[PDB]
């Protein structure tokens, strides 16, 4: 009967996307850098981690993604609101699509960074990760023949 949604979704502005899991948007007159939660692209080499060996074009993915997104929204979780760097953490959406599950759906970003209570969508993201693993898309280009837990 009444409209019912999940968490609090707020509108934002597309200022300039940097990487696939990082984009600068505007919020209530506040340009900040948001980073996809529960995801870690191999191209992003901020830490000593570096790119394993699949450095794809994630930045381009979110590039045309939010660029064509008729509406860019952000959903802060119930955990903290920013990281130790002040970055804003929130699941971004576009046209009703979860950008986080988008990259993980194309087998580009690997699920990771799990620190409760910031993982409300841990089962939904892990699900898209299982589909990208069976489809073997990009990073999932291994030779799953014998298989084994």
The residues assigned a catalytic role are 35, 43, 87
As annotated, the binding site for Ca(2+) includes 21, 40-41
In whole angstroms, how far apart are CA 98 and each of 71, 101, 103, 125? 12, 5, 9, 9
Give dist(CA 98, CA 108) in Å, integer: 14
Q: Does 46 bind ligand THP (CB under 6 A)?
A: yes
Shortest Å distance, C-beta 59 to ligand THP: 14
Whose Cβ is closer to ligand THP: residue 81's or residue 136's?
Answer: 81
Whose Cβ is closer to ligand THP: residue 47's or residue 96's?
Answer: 47
Contact residue for ligand THP among 4, 8, 47, 53 (CB under 6 A):
47
- Residue 96: which region, alpha, beta or left (left: phi > 0; alpha: psi -120 to 50)? left
Residues numbered 7 to 26 that lie near ligand THP (CB under 6 A) are: none
Shortest Å distance, C-beta 134 to ligand THP: 26
Q: Does 27 bind ligand THP (CB under 6 A)?
A: no
Give dist(CA 79, CA 99) in Å, integer: 20
At CA 89, angle to CA 69 and CA 102, rounded to 5?
40
x/- mask, ligand THP, residues 77-116, rule CB under 6 A, reads ------x---x-------------------------x-x-
Residues 112, 117, 123, 128: is their CA dihedral positive or negative? Answer: negative
Give dist(CA 117, CA 140) in Å, integer: 29
Q: Which residues bind ligand THP (CB under 6 A)?
A: 35, 37, 46-47, 83, 87, 113, 115, 118
């Amino acid at each position: 009967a009444t409209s019912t949604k999940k968490l609090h979704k707020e509108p934002a502005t597309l200022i300039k996307a940097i990487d696939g899991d990082t984009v600068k948007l505007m919020y209530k007159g506040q340009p900040m850098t948001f980073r996809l939660l529960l995801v870690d692209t191999p191209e992003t080499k901020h830490p000593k981690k570096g790119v394993e060996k699949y450095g794809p074009e994630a930045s381009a993915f979110t590039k045309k993604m939010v660029e064509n997104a008729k509406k860019i929204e952000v959903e802060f979780d119930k955990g903290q609101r920013t990281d130790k760097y002040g970055r804003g953490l929130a699941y971004i959406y576009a046209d009703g699509k979860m950008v986080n599950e988008a990259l993980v759906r194309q087998g580009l970003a690997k699920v990771a960074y799990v620190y409760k209570p910031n993982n409300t969508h841990e089962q939904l993201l892990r699900k898209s990760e299982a589909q990208a693993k069976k489809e073997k898309l990009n990073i999932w280009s291994e030779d799953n023949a014998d298989s084994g837990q």
